[PDB]
Amino acid sequence: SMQEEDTFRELRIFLRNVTHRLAIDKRFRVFTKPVDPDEVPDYVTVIKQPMDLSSVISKIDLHKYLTVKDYLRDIDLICSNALEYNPDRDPGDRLIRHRACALRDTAYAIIKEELDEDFEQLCEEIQESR
Numbered sequence: 058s059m060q061e062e063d064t065f066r067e068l069r070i071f072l073r074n075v076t077h078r079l080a081i082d083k084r085f086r087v088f089t090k091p092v093d094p095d096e097v098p099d100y101v102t103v104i105k106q107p108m109d110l111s112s113v114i115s116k117i118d119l120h121k122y123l124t125v126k127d128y129l130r131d132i133d134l135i136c137s138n139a140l141e142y143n144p145d146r147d148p149g150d151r152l153i154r155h156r157a158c159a160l161r162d163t164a165y166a167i168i169k170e171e172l173d174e175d176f177e178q179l180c181e182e183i184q185e186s187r
């Protein structure tokens with residue numbers, strides 16, 4: 058219905074705003090673009106489903122997220138990929154892990170404070186009806 062499409066458009070506006078605030082944070086620069094094989098050759102060996110903040114923006118605009126839960130699954134994938142690719146005690150690994158945990162925590166904290174629970178419930182109920 059037209060009212061349901063208005064609901065999903067508001068969700069997209071919200072998700073673009075959250076994603077933009079993550080992408081401009083200097084701590085999260087490493088998560089802003091897809092990993093380039095020429096700069097990180099062994100990445101494809103470890104990471105089966107790559108994800109980054111530019112890919113998240115593309116998915117918003119392709120109407121792939123109908124709930125904030127679906128969006129947070131991709132934020133969580135950005136973080137879990139970073140933890141999997143950076144498991145060692147070396148400081149380069151530990152720095153990326155710290156930033157990945159901060160990305161996850163920051164996204165969840167923004168959503169917990171700024172997303173109305175009834176709005177998310179409406180999105181989920183529309184999704185379950187389709």
Ligand SMILES: CC(=O)c1nc(NC(=O)[C@@H](C)N)sc1-c1cccc(O)c1
Nearest residue numbers: 087088092093138139142143149150153
């Ligand atoms: C995001 C990620 O998992 C990632 N991990 C690294 N780990 C390392 O360099 C070594 C120290 N474990 S570099 C890196 C990365 C990826 C894209 C751009 C960029 O500037 C950095």
Ligand SMILES: CC(=O)c1nc(NC(=O)[C@@H](C)N)sc1-c1cccc(O)c1
Nearest residue numbers: 125126129165168169172173174177178
């Ligand atoms: C989208 C969702 O299912 C969701 N997941 C959370 N994760 C947690 O509580 C744990 C995993 N940190 S908080 C949260 C949430 C946040 C705001 C409004 C709302 O209705 C739900």
